[PDB]
Design a protein around this ligand. Structure first.
Ligand code: HEM
Length: 414
């Protein structure tokens, strides 16, 4: 398929950027280029998820994200992703309510329970712990033999990081990757064969975490996420559904995003070897490289809202009940705000000014944890490797939400 030809040729009204097939072949940029130029607040009438608004420009996306009283995230209105099966009991899905899918006032009550995980002193302890654990993984990677970087680096380090945050048994940490993966999938997408199989694996997740929760309730408070839920007065009446929904948020939130950033790091070093060379020669560039990895990869391609009011936005009449989608993958390529945004630039000015963590009351809680783990990985790459070679076909995730990789064949050079 030639996405450039279609995007030039078809009527504006027939553009649907939501198809997971487009993400699998990273074919979105010709469509987004046309929408940002010709119709930046665009109504799509025909899609699998019903009709929706696409918000494609940087400034416009900030406006939606920061107006939570007009543009709702609440689970009672359908929650915060475009595909209604991921978090609602519809068409084979199950109900997964959580504080990212809550509007105020309840949102703030739940966020405050887990916000100590990024207290300053915990970030310092976390950084010291991660450093040694990361060193140990990287020092066993072969030189001059092909391996899947997603398997040996992205998953290996990400599941070690999330296990540290949950104090999850280290020997079972592969379960965290499995549970994360099935939350954002559908039957036939290559992970589960049925909705029922998905439901079974999530009940197994619930049973495992319930055992851990009961253990944490009976020991002193510790700086781990399950401990924080287990000792919180305001969390004592979670229904089974709310508990499972909250676990889903913490498992996917810390897993899929960081994994995708680690996979993008390898792609960046191969496609832009001179930028890797720069930071290797000058380690002060880590400050600008890490936010740029996250902007360039954009691990979460969109977040979705539902309008609670009729509202005229940039000249367009949004109606109460309409789906509104913030395309972070488009916004992070808006050259009104970001110069030469298709390329990876180790040394970019105002490198923290990107959309990948959102803006407003739902801005990513764990952004400092991700950035510290990515810093430590780049420190180690810089010390151990002359270059990172992608030597076979990359295989991408079929999702309009998770913007990441299944397979990146690499060879390391020293
Ligand atoms: C590069 C890594 C990451 C990216 C790109 C990312 C992206 C996001 C985005 C896009 C949101 C929603 C923003 C909005 O709607 O305005 C979010 C929220 C959240 N993230 Fe992250 N995230 C990352 C790492 C992490 C990690 C490591 C954790 C936990 C250990 C985490 C936990 C959360 C939580 C709990 C929320 C909900 C905040 C709320 O509703 O108040 N994230 N993240």
């Amino acid at each position: 398929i030639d996405d450039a030809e279609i995007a030039r040729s078809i009527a504006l009204e027939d553009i649907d950027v939501s198809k997971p097939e487009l993400f699998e072949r990273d074919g979105l940029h010709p469509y987004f280029e046309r929408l940002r130029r010709e119709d930046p607040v665009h109504y799509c009438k025909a899609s699998e998820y019903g009709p929706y608004w696409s918000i494609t420009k940087f400034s416009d996306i900030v406006a939606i994200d920061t107006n939570h009283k007009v543009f709702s995230s609440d689970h009672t209105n359908g929650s915060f992703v475009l595909d209604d099966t991921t978090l609602n009991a519809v068409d084979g899905g199950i109900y997964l309510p959580n504080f990212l899918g809550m509007d105020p006032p309840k949102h703030d009550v739940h966020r405050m329970v887990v916000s100590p995980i990024v207290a300053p002193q915990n970030l310092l302890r976390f950084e010291a712990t991660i450093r040694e654990r990361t060193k140990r993984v990287l020092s066993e990677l072969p030189i001059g033999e092909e391996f899947n970087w997603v398997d040996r680096v992205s998953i290996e380090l990400t599941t070690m990081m999330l296990a540290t945050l949950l104090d999850f048994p280290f020997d079972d940490r592969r379960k965290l990757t499995r549970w994360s993966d099935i939350i954002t999938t559908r039957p036939g997408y290559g992970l589960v064969d049925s909705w029922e199989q998905r439901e079974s694996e999530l009940m197994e997740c619930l049973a495992y975490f319930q055992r851990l929760y009961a253990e944490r309730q009976a020991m002193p408070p510790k700086p781990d996420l399950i401990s924080m839920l287990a000792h919180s007065p305001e969390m004592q009446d979670l229904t089974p559904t709310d508990f499972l929904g909250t676990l889903a948020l913490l498992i996917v939130g810390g897993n899929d995003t960081t994994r995708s950033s680690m996979s993008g790091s390898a792609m960046a070093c191969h496609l832009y070897p001179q930028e890797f060379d720069k930071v290797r020669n000058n380690r002060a560039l880590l400050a600008s490289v890490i936010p740029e990895v996250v902007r360039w990869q954009t691990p979460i391609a969109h977040m979705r809202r539902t309008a609670l009011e009729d509202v005229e936005f940039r000249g367009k009449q949004i109606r109460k009940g309409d789906k509104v989608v913030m395309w972070y993958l488009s916004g992070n390529r808006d050259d009104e705000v970001i110069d030469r945004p298709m390329d990876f630039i180790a040394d970019r000015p105002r490198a923290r000014h990107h959309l990948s963590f959102g803006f407003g009351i739902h801005r990513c809680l764990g952004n400092r944890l991700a950035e510290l783990q990515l810093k430590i990985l780049w420190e180690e790459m810089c010390e151990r490797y002359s270059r990172i070679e992608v030597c076979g076909e990359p295989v991408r995730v079929p999702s309009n939400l998770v913007h990441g990789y299944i397979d990146i064949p690499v060879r390391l050079h020293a």
